[PDB]
Design a protein around this nucleic acid. Structure first.
Ligand SMILES: [Mg+2]
Ligand SMILES: [Mg+2]
Ligand SMILES: [Mg+2]
Ligand SMILES: [Mg+2]
Ligand SMILES: [Mg+2]
Ligand SMILES: [Mg+2]
Ligand SMILES: [Mg+2]
Ligand SMILES: [Mg+2]
Ligand SMILES: [Mg+2]
Ligand SMILES: [Mg+2]
Ligand SMILES: [Mg+2]
Ligand SMILES: [Mg+2]
Ligand SMILES: [Mg+2]
Ligand SMILES: [Mg+2]
Ligand SMILES: [Mg+2]
Ligand SMILES: [Mg+2]
Ligand SMILES: [Mg+2]
Ligand SMILES: [Mg+2]
Lengths: 52, 175, 49, 60, 126
RNA sequence: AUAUUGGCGAGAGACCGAUAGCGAACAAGUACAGUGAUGGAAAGAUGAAAAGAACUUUGAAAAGAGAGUGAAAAAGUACGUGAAAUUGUUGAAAGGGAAGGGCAUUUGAUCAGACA
RNA sequence: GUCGAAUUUGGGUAUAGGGGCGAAAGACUAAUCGAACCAUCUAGUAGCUGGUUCCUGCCGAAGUUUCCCUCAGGAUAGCAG
RNA sequence: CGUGGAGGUCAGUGACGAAGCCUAGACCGUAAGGUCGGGUCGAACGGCCUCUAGUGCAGAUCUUGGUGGUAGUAGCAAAUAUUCAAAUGAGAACUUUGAAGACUGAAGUGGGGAAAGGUUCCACGUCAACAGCAGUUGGACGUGGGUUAGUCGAUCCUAAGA
């Protein structure tokens, strides 16, 4: 699916935050918040060069 | 079933176990090691004396920043304690093992703790709230305990031709 | 009745190990807190004392 | 050793013992070639498988 | 090999249809073959199983046993015979779940609808 | 004649195989969070059949030991298999302010081939 | 410090983001203000930093030349196939 | 050299045990790797000729999950304070009653309400989890009971406003 791994509202926390600069899920109150996103090395993210 | 170690000739042995016991793993290991190899009745009397604070359990591995006592001189150590909860759990398992041996018909006066083993049960995970709105773990480390008591019960040499000749010559020289 | 009671008691064990106050205790923790992992403290106003 | 009849960690499972017995039967064949409730229910099933005159013409 | 475009060879679809089949479809799915004598008598091979017919077990550990169908448990895809049980020490008896394809019907429960079904399948009763 | 990532009904694949594939294979847009717009998880596998361990015994009890069911309990509703990190017990060994590695041999333990 | 008024305060109501409100501190506007929060365009943009997954055999370099006015960014000659 | 899938072939391997995993055992390759034995396991899988790709990890303050040393360590030291006997109970520093010592000191640690919460109120039963010790106790768990208006409010009126 062309939308796989992209239906996520996430943003990077910036440099110098003692964590990796991968975009992270916002919001709160759930285990999803703060997890990495959008990257091919991230669980639940988008694969590298998706098949067409 | 499936103990860490079993006894050959199981008709002269008895076993007891307790799983997911909410007691300190480190203190329980120290108590079990203090009891390992002893006679059953002597071990039970020793545990009663430990509860009465007449003797102590020597702490050998999990013993950083522990106070010093004179009751460790019996075992040649400086650090010993009196873990009441661990002693009570081990006493319960010893009593169960003695009951199992009596039901099997074994002689109670010849029983000795031939095996005792403490393992880490899955941890109980409470959590605590800390400053600046933090959440930190607060975990109990439960123990799996098992023990087995047992009744106490009471070369071709090839030589070279030279060696054979030397032995034959010595035999001829002697009587 | 006893069989159903044993089934419920066996089912309860995982939430008991997680130390839930009951079936209604479903608090969820985030993976990371941004106010704890968003710190670059200059010479000026801080976020906590 | 159990056929011939301290503390050890060497144990034999019943599954492996049954498999060894089965394989030994196979090898021996090659060498040669080269309930109270039931009883109660059965018993019950097998078991189940002038005159007199009182009073008279009046109302007591 | 199939030839129609309306039939599917998809394993996933076949398994889903089998496991979600309603009660009326499970009645047809739980069909049992007739015995040699009943086959010679009626001219038919298999019928859906029902409650008051006698069967013979031809497969499994209970092979050779006979009895009357105690129930047709369509929810668990099984039939229960009154004489085929498992006994415990405390007097408990648990029915053995048998599949009708592993049985053989030795005496049909006959009624008006049963005779109509046999005749429309091509039967020659009596 | 053309379009069709919505709806209804079908058939398929050199596609993915539970951290993959839709966020969701499961009471998933659920639980939970936010005043709100919105954000949004984790989570599949006993066994062919619950036959899910009757009964005795120790324990206040959870449970243990016998016994029993089952092909198997090295399948006990923590349930197919059951790796690593990390841990316990047993046995062997080394250790005077790190350990680990390479070349060579001694010692202890252990082991294959060739046995006409 | 102040403590009977430019006083303290509940509720209702009005003002909304290139806007409000400000006894003016670029203060405050839901722990967010040198530009509130939410979703989308969007996998926005790299002068830069970090990383980039099996083996063996054989061959194997480059700061040395001319130029775009000079930095930057490019062309060209040389060395290796 | 190795991995997922595809066409062909070995009428290939397999419940007398496929795949996987463990192994103080054995062999072949310079190596990538390949092969055999033993244990565990329980249903699928491989050699060769070719086709194909989401095909090989030690690093990215990498992602998700799990686990150590620290460590039985830091700590559980604000709000003056507890003690005796009996009962209950397997178990009592913490439950109940009695006996004592104290405290809030009417701007209360008292008696009611507004916002908010939604059954937390009360009875019976009851301890696996929670009450950072304990627990026979509880705002916990299980089953129920309980809120009665012509006069108290809403309902009606209008205020800034909508
Ligand atoms: Mg994905
Ligand atoms: Mg200290
Ligand atoms: Mg707070
Ligand atoms: Mg998923
Ligand atoms: Mg398992
Ligand atoms: Mg390990
Ligand atoms: Mg195998
Ligand atoms: Mg890749
Ligand atoms: Mg890694
Ligand atoms: Mg590297
Ligand atoms: Mg890291
Ligand atoms: Mg301390
Ligand atoms: Mg105090
Ligand atoms: Mg005072
Ligand atoms: Mg006073
Ligand atoms: Mg507590
Ligand atoms: Mg109350
Ligand atoms: Mg209640």
């Amino acid at each position: 699916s062309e939308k796989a791994g992209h239906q996520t509202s996430a943003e990077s926390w910036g440099t110098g935050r003692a964590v990796a600069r991968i975009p992270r899920v916002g919001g709160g109150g759930t285990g999803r918040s703060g997890q990495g996103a959008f990257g091919n090395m991230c669980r639940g993210g988008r694969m590298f060069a998706p098949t067409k | 079933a499936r103990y860490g170690a079993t006894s050959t000739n199981p008709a002269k042995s008895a076993s007891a176990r307790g799983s997911y016991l909410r007691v300190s793993f480190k203190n329980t290991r120290e108590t079990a090691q203090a009891i390992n190899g002893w006679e059953l009745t002597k071990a039970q009397k020793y545990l009663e004396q430990v509860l009465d604070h007449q003797r102590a359990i020597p702490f050998r591995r999990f013993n950083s920043s522990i106070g010093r006592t004179a009751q460790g001189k019996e075992f040649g150590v400086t650090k010993a304690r009196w873990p009441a909860k661990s002693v009570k759990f081990v006493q319960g398992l010893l009593q169960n093992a003695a009951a199992n041996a009596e039901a099997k018909g074994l002689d109670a006066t010849k029983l000795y703790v031939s095996h005792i083993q403490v393992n880490q049960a899955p941890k109980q995970r409470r959590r605590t709230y800390r400053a600046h709105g933090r959440i930190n773990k607060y975990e109990s480390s439960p123990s799996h305990i098992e023990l087995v008591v047992t009744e106490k019960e009471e070369k071709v040499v090839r030589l070279t031709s030279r060696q054979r000749g030397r032995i034959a010559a010595q035999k001829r020289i002697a009587a | 009745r006893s069989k159903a009671d044993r089934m419920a008691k066996m089912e309860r064990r995982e939430r008991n190990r997680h130390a839930k106050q009951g079936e209604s205790d479903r608090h969820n923790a985030v993976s990371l807190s941004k106010h704890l992992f968003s710190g670059k403290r200059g010479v000026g106003k801080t976020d906590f004392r | 050793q159990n056929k011939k009849n301290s503390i050890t960690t060497r144990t034999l499972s019943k599954k492996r013992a049954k498999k060894i017995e089965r394989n030994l039967k196979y090898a021996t064949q090659r060498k040669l070639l080269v309930s109270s409730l039931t009883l109660v229910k059965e018993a019950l099933w097998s078991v189940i498988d002038q005159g007199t005159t009182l009073g008279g013409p009046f109302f007591p | 090999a199939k030839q129609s475009l309306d039939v599917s060879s998809d394993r996933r679809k076949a398994r889903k249809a089998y496991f979600t089949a309603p009660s009326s479809q499970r009645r047809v799915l739980l069909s049992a073959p007739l015995s040699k004598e009943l086959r010679a008598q009626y001219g038919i091979k298999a019928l859906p199983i029902r409650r008051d017919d006698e069967v013979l077990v031809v497969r499994g550990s209970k092979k050779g046993q006979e009895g009357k169908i105690s129930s047709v448990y369509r929810l668990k895809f099984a039939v229960q015979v009154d004489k085929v049980t498992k006994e415990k020490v405390n007097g408990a008896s648990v029915p053995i779940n048998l599949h009708p394809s592993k049985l053989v019907i030795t005496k049909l429960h006959l009624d008006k609808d049963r005779k109509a079904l046999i005749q429309r399948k091509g039967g020659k009763l009596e």
